[PDB]
Design a binder for these strands. Structure first.
Length: 90
RNA sequence: CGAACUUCGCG
RNA sequence: CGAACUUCGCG
């Protein structure tokens, strides 16, 4: 049901002002698809986060956990872009 | 985490 | 929408 990859967003790997979430939003626009929908969840252990992104009725999620909601969403966008072999920026 | 606040970038 | 920046409140 969900496509997963072991990915973590590291801002240092991307030029300033460029993000996987932005790239995905732009790709959906060009492909005339909806708009990504993110469902984010919290861990009571280390106060860790994960996110499931829905694009073209398919769900994507990293196998890894992140320090914040925003970082988890970026990881989910990476899974979506990368699993499709899409640019994702840098 | 959320909200407010300026700056920046794409629609 | 998204990024950086401070502030507030709660957590």
């Amino acid at each position: 049901g969900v496509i997963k990859m072991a990915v973590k967003f590291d801002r240092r790997a991307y030029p300033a002002q460029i993000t996987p979430k932005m790239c995905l939003l732009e790709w959906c626009r060009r492909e005339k698809l909806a708009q990504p929908v993110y469902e984010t969840v919290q861990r009571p252990l280390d106060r860790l986060f994960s996110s499931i992104v829905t694009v073209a009725e398919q769900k994507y999620q990293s196998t890894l956990w992140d320090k914040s909601k925003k970082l988890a969403e970026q990881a989910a966008a990476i899974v979506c872009l990368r699993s499709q072999g899409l640019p994702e920026g840098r």
